[PDB]
Design a protein around this ligand. Structure first.
Ligand SMILES: O=S(=O)(Oc1cccc(F)c1)[C@@H]1C[C@@H]2O[C@H]1C(c1ccc(O)cc1)=C2c1ccc(O)cc1
Ligand SMILES: O=S(=O)(Oc1cccc(F)c1)[C@@H]1C[C@@H]2O[C@H]1C(c1ccc(O)cc1)=C2c1ccc(O)cc1
Lengths: 231, 10, 236, 9
């Protein structure tokens, strides 16, 4: 059913599936900083799972295939979401409407400031590029379907990914871009995905080290263990 | 099994 | 300089700058041990790095960057570059990784080193993807150059080097599309293939990150001063 | 750095 959708139908479907922006719990230490972020990420994961089920083609996958994709891409997905909503706030990371942080605060947690800087740089990149919401949701779904497609030790997913490419190009053509500007922008956006993968990997590397600072939920741990099981 | 096994089915 | 090149000039430049395929010192009579396997791979990578550094200098736009930026990019991308090279020369060897013409390994041999087989499986999967797509040599050199310029661009008040890099990257994209148009692909097919190729770069990053993680945990066999300094850039 | 040197040659 996903492949039969038009470009507009794909966009509408993705926009409609968008998760809500959650608030943080209402003077930061290492423990307090991690507590807020962990609690927030945990609540976001539940919404992500229901968002994923609404990404066209995802439902067509076996339960195990769905688990694997989400296990691979969860932090990437949180990160691109964070960068997206931080766009209108140069120099800051909008974790929640009531939680806007600068790099200075990233220092509260060892090794986190380096990730903050990467995230801030990504946000600026999106801002420089004038990323549209319709493009954002396309990128986010791509991360979901792509990041774990090989790890699968595949045609359906690749056909869906093609569909999303068509959709991205369709959006750009509407924005009035030239054919050359279309493929250059396409490349620019997809290359940023490599950096988002990089951020996830490095962040994950730290996250499954410090499991014990604060208490992590059973779900958050199972998501983490999925990556730690290979480190 | 996995908590993710649930939630996905729900 | 790099910005005045035509698509055909970019390709011929990249092709001419290709490094040679080096041999390992694999003695078909050892046969193996974690240490020996790693000795071979380490020995090979070290010699490859020397060729990689001189190859980078021939990538259009690279020498326009400050020395410090050149160092950063290579420190970021060295393993990704080795990996895409490995996957490229392994294309015509299903189920096998051609580290050198005299060193063709399968996944079972990859079990010789703890945690390395997981990476082998990902590398094999990547080679399988390239073979499916029938990746061309002209496309390969474009992708490898993109890795060099892109991987470290977001972790560097000049600001104009990052900009210079983006223009060069845009030109490589122009070149890729040019090749696909020449191949007879339709507009939709060009855009689709371009995306397919670039998405693979995300997986090459992933493989490098996971591999690097293992590499700088076990800094065992002599790790040539160059290698140590390259790994150190990522550690810890 | 070594890399620094080889690039510098
Ligand atoms: O990549 S990190 O910055 O993680 C760490 C955590 C500690 C040290 C360190 F170097 C890195 C990551 C990104 C951001 O901040 C860390 C973090 C997070 C922390 C704990 C956790 O259980 C889950 C997520 C983040 C986060 C959380 C929610 C969100 O919507 C977007 C990003
Ligand atoms: O990513 S790995 O597989 O490294 C690992 C991963 C896990 C355990 C381990 F010991 C090493 C990597 C990929 C391939 O095999 C490992 C490796 C390598 C090993 C040692 C070294 O000093 C440098 C590179 C590889 C390699 C080497 C050369 C080349 O042209 C392409 C790939």
């Amino acid at each position: 059913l996903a492949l039969s959708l038009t470009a507009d139908q794909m966009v509408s479907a993705l926009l409609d599936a968008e998760p809500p922006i959650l608030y943080s719990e209402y003077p930061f230490s290492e423990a307090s900083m991690m507590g807020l972020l962990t609690n927030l990420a945990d609540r976001e994961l539940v919404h992500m799972i229901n968002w994923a089920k609404r990404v066209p083609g995802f439902v067509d996958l076996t339960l195990h295939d769905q688990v694997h994709l989400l296990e691979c891409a969860w932090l990437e997905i949180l990160m691109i979401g964070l960068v997206w909503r931080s766009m209108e706030h140069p120099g800051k990371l909008l974790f929640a409407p009531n939680l806007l942080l600068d790099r200075n605060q990233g220092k509260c947690v060892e090794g986190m400031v380096e990730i903050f800087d990467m995230l801030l740089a990504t946000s600026s990149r999106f801002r420089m590029m004038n990323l549209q919401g319709e493009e954002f949701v396309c990128l986010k779904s791509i991360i979901l379907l792509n990041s774990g497609v090989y790890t699968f030790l595949k045609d359906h997913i690749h056909r869906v990914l093609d569909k999303i490419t068509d959709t991205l190009i369709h959006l750009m053509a509407k924005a009035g871009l030239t054919l050359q500007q279309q493929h250059q922008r396409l490349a620019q956006l997809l290359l940023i995905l490599s950096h988002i993968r990089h951020m996830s990997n490095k962040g994950m590397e730290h996250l499954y080290s410090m499991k014990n600072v604060v208490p992590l939920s059973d779900l958050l741990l199972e998501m983490l263990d999925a990556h730690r099981l290979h480190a | 099994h996995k908590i993710l096994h649930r939630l996905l089915q729900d």
